[PDB]
Amino acid sequence: MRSIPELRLGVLGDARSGKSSLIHRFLTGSYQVLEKTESEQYKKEMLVDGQTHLVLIREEAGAPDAKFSGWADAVIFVFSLEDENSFQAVSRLHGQLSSLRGRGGLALALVGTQDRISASSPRVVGDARARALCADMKRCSYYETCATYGLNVDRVFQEVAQKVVTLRKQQQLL
């Protein structure tokens, strides 16, 4: 039976983060103003190191639980660059993830979304501050995204998938 290599990617963020629109952009190429009130799962095929993977994505509406925290190979944290509470929410969410995971080591990403930046709702989260949150999270890379035109959307997903695959190859290299 031909193997189906699988990458399990979780996505965390508050309702102002832009996480639903970001997931939806990656999957479909479309921007839609969405707030999923609820957790949901999605699937996509991705080429990684020349090998086709099944990618499972769980978007979580609130705090991760031990189920989610133990299932993921990788977790993307999402906040809005114009919402301070969403940024503070990432560090809350990461505390929960870290404690409820009990495994090989997660690939992480931190995403600051640009979608809602306006004159009346300006960027409130400074670059250095966001990069400091990322520097204090293990195996984490930081991106700004804009799902409206696709800025770094595929990049985030692809780079987290690559991290998982490289970690796995490291493990089999031992």
Q: Is 60 annotated as a binding residue?
A: yes
Q: Is 39 annotated as a binding residue?
A: no
Q: Is 19 annotated as a binding residue?
A: yes
Distance of CA 173 to the CA centre of its chain: 27
Instruction: Give the phi and the psi of residue 72 in degrees, each rounded to 5.
Output: -60, 140
Q: Is 18 annotated as a binding residue?
A: yes
Q: Is 59 annotated as a binding residue?
A: yes
Q: Is 123 annotated as a binding residue?
A: no
Q: Is 116 annotated as a binding residue?
A: yes
Q: Is 127 annotated as a binding residue?
A: no
Q: Is 114 annotated as a binding residue?
A: yes
Dihedral sign from CA coordinates of 151, 154, 158, 160: positive
Q: Is 113 annotated as a binding residue?
A: yes
Q: Could you please report the per-residue DSSP string of 88-133?
A: HHHHHHHHHHHHH------EEEEEEE-TT--SSS---S-HHHHHHH
Q: Is 101 annotated as a binding residue?
A: no
Q: Is 58 annotated as a binding residue?
A: yes
Distances (CA, A) of 131 to 77, 92, 126, 136, 139: 13, 16, 9, 9, 13
Identify whether the C-beta of residue 70 lies closer than 8 Å to the C-beta of residue 4: no
The vertex-167 CA angle with 163 and 171, nearest 5°, equals 170
Q: Is 95 annotated as a binding residue?
A: no
Q: Is 154 annotated as a binding residue?
A: no
Name the binding residues.
13-20, 57-61, 113-116
Name the binding residues for GTP.
13-20, 57-61, 113-116
